[PDB]
Design an enzyme around this catalytic site. Structure first.
Site, PDB file in Angstrom:
ATOM      1  N   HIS A  43      -9.989  -8.824  -4.062  1.00  0.00           N
ATOM      2  CA  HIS A  43      -8.501  -9.228  -4.743  1.00  0.00           C
ATOM      3  C   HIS A  43      -7.397  -8.281  -4.564  1.00  0.00           C
ATOM      4  O   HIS A  43      -7.608  -7.198  -4.069  1.00  0.00           O
ATOM      5  CB  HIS A  43      -8.823  -9.086  -6.300  1.00  0.00           C
ATOM      6  CG  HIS A  43      -8.919  -7.884  -6.882  1.00  0.00           C
ATOM      7  ND1 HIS A  43      -8.218  -7.316  -7.937  1.00  0.00           N
ATOM      8  CD2 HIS A  43      -9.689  -6.648  -6.378  1.00  0.00           C
ATOM      9  CE1 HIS A  43      -8.396  -6.012  -8.263  1.00  0.00           C
ATOM     10  NE2 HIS A  43      -9.256  -5.628  -7.338  1.00  0.00           N
ATOM     11  N   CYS A  97      -4.794  -1.138  -7.652  1.00  0.00           N
ATOM     12  CA  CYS A  97      -6.252  -1.032  -7.996  1.00  0.00           C
ATOM     13  C   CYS A  97      -6.857  -0.263  -7.100  1.00  0.00           C
ATOM     14  O   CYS A  97      -6.442   0.145  -5.771  1.00  0.00           O
ATOM     15  CB  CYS A  97      -6.978  -2.296  -8.087  1.00  0.00           C
ATOM     16  SG  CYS A  97      -8.493  -2.425  -8.571  1.00  0.00           S
ATOM     17  N   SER A 138      -5.461  -6.850 -16.809  1.00  0.00           N
ATOM     18  CA  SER A 138      -5.025  -5.806 -16.048  1.00  0.00           C
ATOM     19  C   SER A 138      -3.622  -6.231 -15.475  1.00  0.00           C
ATOM     20  O   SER A 138      -3.030  -5.139 -14.719  1.00  0.00           O
ATOM     21  CB  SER A 138      -6.290  -5.555 -14.950  1.00  0.00           C
ATOM     22  OG  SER A 138      -7.228  -5.648 -15.652  1.00  0.00           O
ATOM     23  N   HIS A 141      -3.780 -11.341 -10.297  1.00  0.00           N
ATOM     24  CA  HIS A 141      -4.657 -11.037  -9.196  1.00  0.00           C
ATOM     25  C   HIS A 141      -4.502 -12.245  -8.159  1.00  0.00           C
ATOM     26  O   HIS A 141      -4.241 -13.361  -8.575  1.00  0.00           O
ATOM     27  CB  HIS A 141      -6.228 -10.911  -9.540  1.00  0.00           C
ATOM     28  CG  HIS A 141      -6.581 -10.000 -10.660  1.00  0.00           C
ATOM     29  ND1 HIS A 141      -7.169  -9.014 -10.429  1.00  0.00           N
ATOM     30  CD2 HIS A 141      -6.243 -10.104 -11.957  1.00  0.00           C
ATOM     31  CE1 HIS A 141      -7.444  -8.336 -11.546  1.00  0.00           C
ATOM     32  NE2 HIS A 141      -6.838  -8.820 -12.452  1.00  0.00           N
TER      33      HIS A 141
HETATM   34  C1  LIG Z   1      -8.282  -2.091 -10.466  1.00  0.00           C
HETATM   35  C2  LIG Z   1      -9.400  -2.578 -11.166  1.00  0.00           C
HETATM   36  C3  LIG Z   1      -9.444  -4.077 -11.616  1.00  0.00           C
HETATM   37  O1  LIG Z   1      -8.168  -4.425 -12.198  1.00  0.00           O
HETATM   38  C4  LIG Z   1     -10.601  -4.828 -11.346  1.00  0.00           C
HETATM   39  C5  LIG Z   1     -11.927  -4.677 -10.863  1.00  0.00           C
HETATM   40  C6  LIG Z   1     -12.692  -5.704 -10.572  1.00  0.00           C
HETATM   41  C7  LIG Z   1     -11.929  -7.008 -10.829  1.00  0.00           C
HETATM   42  S1  LIG Z   1     -10.389  -6.543 -11.502  1.00  0.00           S
END
Ligand SMILES: *CCC(=O)c1cccs1
EC number: 5.2.1.8
Length: 147
Positions: A43, A97, A138, A141
């Site tokens: 991602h 990330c 978060s 993505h």
């Molecule tokens: C940077 C961490 C984050 O947003 C994720 C980790 C695994 C999938 S999303």
């Protein structure tokens, strides 16, 4: 007839039909082709001021708006789709990330580990397919299913 989450749609500018996946936010002109215990994805995350933790290795205090993060996600998607840029290249340079250091690779995972919108989009992608913008707490993505 269409695989999970896909629907036929009408293009505003051209009038030509296209296909849209409401689980992955992918869209394409071509009719889509077509579940495993695990998938593997990379991602590229773009954070914003309403992210759960508005900080990253790129920027101690992320201040951009949600709307500005979505514009940035849209531009990366354009460059990946035109081939101007590789997905791995943009994730390495611009993902907010720690997975950026691994070209965005998160490894394999099952259902019941990731945030739900990420998990749903990941398992709805076919191998080799890329998502549209995928929204989680978060940030926003772009997801690439690699296995
Ligand atoms: C940077 C961490 C984050 O947003 C994720 C980790 C695994 C999938 S999303």
């Amino acid at each position: 007839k269409l695989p999970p989450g896909w629907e036929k749609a009408m293009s505003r500018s051209s009038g030509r039909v296209y296909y849209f996946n409401h689980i992955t936010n992918a869209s394409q002109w071509e009719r889509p082709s077509g579940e495993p215990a695990r998938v593997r994805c990379s991602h590229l995350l773009v954070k914003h001021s309403q992210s759960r933790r508005p900080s990253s290795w790129r920027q101690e205090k992320i201040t951009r708006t949600k709307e500005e993060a979505l514009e940035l996600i849209n531009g990366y998607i354009q460059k990946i789709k035109s081939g101007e840029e590789d997905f791995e290249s943009l994730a390495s340079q611009f993902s907010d990330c720690s997975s950026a250091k691994a070209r965005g690779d998160l490894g394999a995972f099952s259902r019941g580990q990731m945030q739900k919108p990420f998990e749903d989009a990941s398992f709805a992608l076919r191998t080799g397919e890329m998502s549209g913008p995928v929204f989680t707490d978060s940030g926003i993505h772009i997801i690439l299913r690699t296995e």
